[model samples]
Target chain A: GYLTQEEIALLLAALDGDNKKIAILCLSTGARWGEAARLKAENIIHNRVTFVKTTNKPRTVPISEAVAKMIADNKRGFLFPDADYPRFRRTMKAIKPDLPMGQATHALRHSFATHFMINGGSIITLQRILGHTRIEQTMVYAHFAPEYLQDAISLNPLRGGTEAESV
Target chain B: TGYLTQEEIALLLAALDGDNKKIAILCLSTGARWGEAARLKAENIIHNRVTFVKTKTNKPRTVPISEAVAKMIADNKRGFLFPDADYPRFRRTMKAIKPDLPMGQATHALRHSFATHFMINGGSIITLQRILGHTRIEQTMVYAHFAPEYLQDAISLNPLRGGTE
Candidate 1:
């Protein structure tokens, strides 16, 4: 299911979108904290864009025109200037005593990599975006998402190991 | 940062000698995931030759079993070495047995620290990479700088990559 309508709605509400535009941009493009923070008042490049680690360095992430305007109107910087990675963890701990096991800033990075891998992103491309010095480090993210496993098993000889063995 | 300090390794090694030594040997040798080590059948080790089905790389590999590991497993005749060795239970049990010993369990930390220290000991990147089953050299590079002593040793040997060709 593509980004659920309800989830999008919740996000818009979080941003208190008086207009439906900024929410649309945030949903359409996967912008990281840095990219969204760095959006210039007169910045160029307007289309469906993501702030991926590219050009052998960090990059600017583009949001939908809706989100762009929201930023322009509010004049917010640091997309999450009030909260940083350590703060995010503390926020989670405060809100819920029990943070889910293995969830952290790294998990956010992992989520991005896994989503990219499943959605036709090449290993080399994802490696670049992740700024991975090694392809294997990027590949570990693929193991976390089982959708890729489904595609992987289809190509392997052990596709129906259980059914075949039960017979 | 919070690496597997020497005290932890010594305690782990000590635990093997007293009780569940076979299990200790299995971890010492393979550095496999808990599930992988637990899934090993007695048949996995043959004629004192242990083959760790390298779960990380999805490959099968055999290593000569040290006398200690071979003897422990032989005495037990158990398929899985550490049947009841999860961290919580093991911590409780280990404390009961030897309260003085300092030990903690992350299972994979030992393997991580092992790879790190191996490089620090002048082990080649390629050799340690193979031992660790890194699919790419770059992943192995992360460990290259993990140990500060290695950096000092490396600089003293080359200084500047053979004086920049």
Candidate 2:
């Protein structure tokens, strides 16, 4: 359930106010729902934001200049003191099917991870960025690497069968 | 029944035997392609809903089936619903009835037939897009003529093509 470029644009257009801010934060960094929702002004240090309530070891991630400006403008208080998640869900269902049975709001995090790999970002770096404590947790996206796809065409045994497939 | 009439479907059902019949019914009812319907596993069916894991779009989709079809799949008692047949085999079966199948080659005929009937029967284009697992609306616009059957409100709903100022 990764969001495509068109999906990201659609999602952003549907949300407004702090909902949009938290979404942009999650889309920019692979922060979990609670991490993005519960962000405070002190969490930011110039261009980077540290996610403390990571539910694991806390990790900091660099964000876009546009997002940095947003955090800076909020001054020294919880930026999203009253984030609305229900509206986020309602707006989300407009583009996608129901969220995974239990994982109601991690679609944005998945979107970030998926595009990161498809764009040739390193899985190892993504593990730390996503705070996926285990390498195994991060390895799920390894197949999205560019090198893994060429093997399908190179090893299909075209040497034996010339059966042309028509669409 | 969009492209193929009831008589045509009846004839094909009469002509086919064994697993071919079950595979055809699954595709006709759910608008599933021949391959997706054929590759369905026992676990893919749950409470009369069928989930297709291996799809042409590489996206997973779960479509509900009639209880009759659901019962038919359960009664088969196998891992895969149709292990005895493939597209080439189904083609040979269809050839005996109509020489070159109904609307197109292979069993896209069933898929198109379901899509056509869905629209003609007042199904919305957006709903059809979700069922057909199309990534974009343009892909589902081929059936827009049938969709116009319910666009009656457009004339009143959008009343400002001309200048209001």
* Residue A17, candidate 2: C-alpha displacement in angstroms: 0.4
Which digits, one per residue and each the tens of the lDDT, describe model 2 over residues B34-143? Answer: 88888788888988778877455645667766566677666656587788865776777666656545545666776776676666654544455556677655566676
Which residue segments of model 1 deviate by more than 4 Å?
Answer: A1-167, B13-21, B54-58, B76-78, B82-87, B91-105, B146-165
Lowest-scoring 10 consecutive residues by lDDT in candidate 1 chain A?
A155-164
The 10 consecutive residues of candidate 2 chain A with the worst lDDT sum are A151-160
For candidate 1, what is the lDDT? 0.43
List per-candidate RMSD values in Å.
18.5, 18.3
What stretches of model 2 exceed 4 Å from their correct place?
A148-167, B1-165
Best by TM-score: 2
First chain of candidate 2, TM-score: 0.83
